[PDB]
Each structure stands twice: as C-alpha cells, then as structure tokens.
Design a protein around this ligand. Structure first.
Ligand SMILES: *[C@@H]1O[C@H](CO)[C@@H](O)[C@H](O)[C@H]1NC(C)=O
Ligand SMILES: *[C@@H]1O[C@H](CO)[C@@H](O)[C@H](O)[C@H]1NC(C)=O
Ligand SMILES: *[C@@H]1O[C@H](CO)[C@@H](O)[C@H](O)[C@H]1NC(C)=O
Ligand SMILES: *[C@@H]1O[C@H](CO)[C@@H](O)[C@H](O)[C@H]1NC(C)=O
Ligand SMILES: *[C@@H]1O[C@H](CO)[C@@H](O)[C@H](O)[C@H]1NC(C)=O
Ligand SMILES: *[C@@H]1O[C@H](CO)[C@@H](O)[C@H](O)[C@H]1NC(C)=O
Ligand SMILES: *[C@@H]1O[C@H](CO)[C@@H](O)[C@H](O)[C@H]1NC(C)=O
Length: 576
C-alpha cells in the first residue's frame, strides 16, 4: 500500500526555451535527485514539487486538488482531466465539487512535474508509451505544457481517484543536447566521486589520472553565547522623561555605563520622526556590546532637524553642535509641541549665531564675553563688536522639537540582554564572546595573560585567545579541519571504480567525522576494512596497499602511485 521505492532515475525537464544543439550544458534548478525514495501508493505535503507518474489506468485517476488547507479556506485549484482534456479551474471550493464559490482547455505513462514558484504553475508532461516490464528503465525528457499565474499559496494536495509521488530539491545537472535539439542523457553532480569530475570537465567521458575537485570542510555542531553577568539598570527613563532638556548652545553630556541596556523600550515613548542612524543598523542593536555610550539633549526649533547629521553644514549647526564625519551613533528624535512651545519666548532658548569661526566637532562653548572685532577698543554694540544672543521665541514647522542624539564607540560595559549557555569546549562549535563571532575548537590555554588585557593576537593579526567574561579564564580559538579532495579514475572505457584523497589531513579526524555526519561532501565512499592508507599528502580511500614495486601510472605524491591491476581493483604501490 505504501512502500519506499528508491529505483528512479527519471524526471528531467527542459529548463528553458532557447535552442541548443550538440552542446553539453550545465545548469542548476529544482531537479529530482537520482536514487531517492519516492512512494508506492490522504493528503501529502507540497514542499517544492512532485513527480506524479502513475502508469496506465484508462483515465481513472482524473484530476487533482490543490490549495493551502483544502478545508474551507484560501482558494484552491483543480487539474480535472477528461476526454476533452484539461478543464482546470481556480476558486475557493469546498467538500466535493458541491458548493464551489469564490482558465482554458489545452489539447500510457502519465508523468507530471508540478512545480509552483514565483506565482506560476508548471505542469510539464510527457506521454511515454512504455510497455516492457522494465518500467523504471529508460529515459524521457519532459516538455512544458501550460504556465499560468495562480498567485495562491499551495502547501498540500490530494489525488482525485499506483502512484509515484516524489519530491524536488535544488541540485545541479549537466544536460546533453542532441544535434536535432533534443535531450538524450543527463548526469547528477552529487552522486559518487565519478559523477562529480564529469561535471567539472563538462564531458561524459574521462581519461585516467587525478582530477582536482571541490573542497571538504567539517561542519559545526552547536552554538554557545557568553555575556557579562547581570546588572539590570537600563537607566534610559531619566533622559527621556525630563520637562526641559537644555538649550542648543548649552547641552548635557550624560554618561551611561554599567547597565544591561534594553533598546526595545524607546519605541513607545513619543512620536518618533528621525529614528535613523549610521554605523550600526537599527533593529540589530540588541545583539552586541558597546564601550562609551553617551546621550545629548537639544530643543532645536525644527528647521535644523535635517541639519543634525554628519556634514550638512548650514551655519547654525557649526557653532552650536557639530558631528564628526565618521559618526557611529544614532540621532533619535521625536515631536513635542503641547508643552514645549508657548505664545511667548524663553530666555535660555538661544543660539550664538555670530561667532567668528566654527567649532571642532564635539565641542561646546559657554563664555558670555562680548565678541570683539573693531579696530579700536570698542565699548558696545554698533561697531563690529557684538555679543551674540538670540532668545528664540516659540509660537504655536516652527514648533520646537527634542533631539536625544546618542554616541557609540566600538572592555565592554553597556549591552543588551542575551541568554547565556554553558561552555562545551573540545568541539567544533560557534561562539559569541561579548561582541564577536567565529568558529573553532575552544580549549584550555597555557599562556601568561596579565590581568588587564583580554584578547590575544598573532603575527598575521588574527584573534587567537579570548578571556571568558564570567569565569576569568583564557581559552584558544583554533579552527578545525578543511582542505581539498582529489578523485582517481582508471578511465570510463575500462571500469567505474574510483578512489579519493583528502589532501593534507591526519584522517583519523575525518574517520570519526564520518560517523557523526559533519562533512560537506555528503557523498560517501565504501570505507571497509583494509581499505584506508595514510599517505604523506592525506589518506587514500578505496585502494589497498601492495608490497610490490612497479612503474608509475598515476602520480599521487610523496612517492606512491595508483594503478588499475587485475577480479580487478585499484592498487597503490611505490615508484620504481
Ligand atoms: C523514504 O520515504 C519513505 C516514504 O514511505 C519513508 O518511509 C522512508 O523512511 C524514507 N527513507 C529515508 C528518509 O531514508
Ligand atoms: C528497482 O527495483 C524494482 C522493484 O520492482 C526492480 O524491478 C528494478 O529492476 C530495480 N532497478 C534497479 C535495481 O536498477
Ligand atoms: C498564503 O497566503 C495567504 C493569504 O495571504 C496566507 O494567509 C497564508 O499563510 C499563505 N500560505 C503559505 C503556506 O505561505
Ligand atoms: C531529428 O533528430 C533525429 C535524431 O538524430 C534525426 O534522426 C532526424 O533526422 C532529425 N530530423 C530532422 C533533422 O528533420
Ligand atoms: C544638564 O546638566 C547637568 C550636569 O550635571 C545634568 O546632570 C542634568 O541632568 C542636566 N540638567 C537639566 C536641567 O536638564
Ligand atoms: C555571576 O553571577 C552568579 C550568579 O549566581 C554568581 O554566582 C557568580 O559568582 C558571578 N560571577 C562573577 C565572575 O561575578
Ligand atoms: C595521527 O594521529 C594519531 C592519533 O593521534 C597519531 O598516532 C599519529 O601519529 C598521527 N599521524 C601523523 C602522520 O601525524
């Protein structure tokens, strides 16, 4: 009734329209992987596509049922088939139809490769008259039939009754095009060492020798996080809940340190209007640690809201407040008119707009001495001498607003909450120490760190050791294995047996990595007993050592060679 069947090598369709002839194309798409459990037939999940391939039944399978839940929900689709051919419809539908509510005809084996991507439905089909008992044997490419926009989300389907529903994954194929525009054969670039070299050479035949191929890398296992212990201070309420902040000329420089700052509380405090900033992207703030967080304050009239930014000098934002060009902070601001503005003016709401020269950024001057610019010693206003003063008068645009510019700098004190996970060590594991990211195998160090320096660098200027900021212990950041693999073949015309060579690894490390499934090359070679040899360039899998000494046929390295010799098997010997 339902058996796993893993003997299909079919389901190759035309990727596109453009004509080709007598070429070997290489393309990647969602193809059905060779030798995958399909079914041998309820509702089924629609991951990315299927390969409904029912054999002859004199048209009793009829159509299909699609949709997102198929039970009185978002619209569905039908693939009803009859003598007139397709009569497909798309609407909500209900229990069969009986209360359908809420399109054209297109004139043995019954293959389909239904695929729904980018709001388009694809019904590739091919009616192959295969009668011989060897049903799985043979090759037949599929031709597109109709593509129509459906727009609806599909994640399940039901047959409307020998079914062979399969599943689709993203893979890479090397297609063969005929002289008269057809496809004769194809090869999957994931199975065995053999059907990977034939993809890099872009040919269906290979000659004897070694062919360099892609790299191998040991994947990690889990992830850990380490943050400073706890403070629970987050004193952001003092700044943001003050009646009057300051003037533009005289402004606070509040310092914030030793707190577990939460940045999610600011979003509901007022009507923000300029919550944008540089250096660090917003909504990613609550994941990393800082060093010198500060906070300013202004009651700027509102015409210079765009003037508060790196640059944008406008003769008003150059004597009062100036930001550096490489300003790594945020310019959080909001709107306030109910309590700030008033029909009259304010004494301290002024700006010195008549100073001789602009300031270096991050500087403030309070001196109230009258400016002197006359030739003779001046006594008051009227000559070039004049004490700058404005005393701006608000009038309920022109409504004064509030600006709470921060200042970041990146020994860390201020950073957000994050769960802590106990150390594991001695495994290829991700890590997060305060603020950083990497991958390696942590272990107990043996260095002589002095009690003021945390990190540890190297000649190449790479991180080497980081102190744990909960136990005050030093560790190592050594990464784990990666390299390259080379495939040995004796020629397609002779045999189909290969060997592999993981370059430059003491491969007891990879032998255990096979069992726990950490390798990147998902394909595996038959690693039986008396079948692994440790060379000076790595280890050879699939060849057995021999005490004899012949002439070299395929040069390996370090003084050994591999040749195909007669039962027949690949052997590895020493040059002579
Ligand atoms: C293959 O699919 C069948 C479907 O019946 C399932 O039972 C079986 O466990 C699968 N085999 C795998 C995932 O190795
Ligand atoms: C796959 O298994 C089927 C089971 O019916 C068999 O007929 C077919 O020959 C097999 N194909 C192989 C082993 O390539
Ligand atoms: C498809 O779209 C509908 C309507 O917006 C939505 O409710 C549903 O979650 C989506 N389904 C899937 C499987 O993404
Ligand atoms: C189509 O291709 C086949 C296969 O090679 C060939 O025999 C046949 O002559 C071609 N038909 C043409 C060119 O009309
Ligand atoms: C600005 O100046 C002082 C300096 O200590 C600061 O503590 C205070 O919060 C600010 N004053 C007002 C009135 O906002
Ligand atoms: C961190 O806090 C825990 C809370 O139980 C405490 O036991 C531990 O000593 C603290 N560690 C340091 C280094 O202060
Ligand atoms: C490989 O590692 C094993 C186990 O630690 C060791 O006995 C052997 O000498 C190593 N081989 C080489 C070539 O370093």
């Amino acid at each position: 009734t339902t058996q796993s069947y893993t003997n299909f090598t079919r389901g190759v369709y035309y990727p596109d329209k453009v004509f080709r002839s007598s070429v070997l194309h290489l393309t990647q798409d969602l193809f059905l992987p060779f030798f995958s459990n399909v079914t041998w037939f309820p509702v089924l999940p629609f991951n990315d596509g299927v390969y409904f391939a029912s054999t002859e039944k004199s048209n009793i399978i009829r159509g299909w049922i699609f949709g997102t839940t198929l039970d009185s929900k978002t619209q569905s689709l039908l693939i009803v088939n009859n003598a007139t051919n397709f009569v497909i419809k798309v609407c909500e539908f209900q229990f069969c139809y009986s209360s359908a509510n809420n399109e054209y005809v297109s004139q043995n084996l019954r293959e389909f490769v239904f695929k729904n991507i980018d709001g388009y439905f694809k019904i590739y089909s091919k009616h192959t008259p295969i009668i011989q008992r060897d049903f799985p044997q043979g090759f037949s490419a599929l031709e597109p039939l109709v593509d129509l926009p459906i727009g609806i989300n599909i994640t399940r389907f039901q047959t409307l009754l020998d079914y062979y529903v399969g599943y689709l994954q993203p893979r890479t194929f090397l297609l063969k095009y005929n002289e008269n525009g057809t496809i004769t054969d194809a090869v999957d670039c994931a199975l065995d060492p053999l059907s990977e070299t034939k993809c890099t050479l872009k040919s269906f035949t290979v000659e004897k020798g070694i062919y360099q191929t892609s790299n191998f890398r040991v994947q990690p296992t889990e992830s850990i996080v380490r943050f400073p212990n706890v403070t629970n201070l987050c004193p952001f309420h003092e700044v943001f809940n003050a009646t009057r902040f300051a003037s533009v000329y005289a402004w606070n420089r509040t310092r914030i340190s030793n707190c577990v700052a939460d940045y999610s509380v600011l979003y509901n405090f007022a009507s923000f209007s300029t919550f944008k900033c540089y250096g660090v992207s917003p909504t990613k703030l609550n994941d990393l640690c800082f060093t010198n967080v500060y906070a300013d304050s202004f009651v700027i009239k509102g015409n210079e809201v765009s003037q508060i930014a790196p640059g944008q000098t406008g003769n008003i934002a150059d004597y009062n407040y100036k930001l550096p060009d490489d300003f790594t902070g945020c310019v959080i601001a909001w709107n306030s008119n109910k309590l700030d503005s008033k029909h009259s003016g304010n004494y301290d709401y002024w700006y010195r707009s008549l100073r001789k020269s602009k300031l270096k950024p991050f500087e403030r001057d309070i001196s109230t001495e009258i400016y002197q610019a006359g030739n003779k010693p001046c006594k008051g206003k009227g000559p070039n001498c004049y004490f700058p003063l404005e005393s701006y008068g608000f009038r309920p645009g022109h409504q004064p607003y509030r600006v709470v510019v921060l200042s970041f700098e990146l020994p860390a004190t201020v950073c957000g909450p994050k769960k802590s996970t106990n150390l594991v060590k001695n495994k290829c594991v991700n890590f997060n120490f305060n603020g950083l990211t990497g991958t390696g195998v942590l272990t107990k160090s043996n260095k002589k760190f002095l009690p003021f320096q945390q990190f540890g660098r190297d000649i190449v200027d790479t991180t080497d050791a980081v102190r744990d900021p909960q136990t005050l212990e030093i560790l190592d950041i050594t990464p784990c294995s990666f390299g390259g693999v080379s495939v040995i073949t004796p020629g397609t015309n002779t045999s189909n047996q290969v060997a592999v060579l993981y370059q430059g690894v003491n491969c007891t490390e990879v032998s255990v990595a096979i069992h726990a499934d950490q390798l990147t090359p998902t394909w595996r070679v038959y690693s039986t007993g008396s079948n692994v040899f440790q060379t000076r360039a790595g280890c050879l899998i699939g060849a057995e050592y021999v005490n004899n000494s012949y002439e070299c046929d395929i040069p390996i390295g370090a003084g050994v060679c591999a040749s195909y010799q007669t039962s027949q098997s690949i052997i590895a010997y020493t040059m002579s």
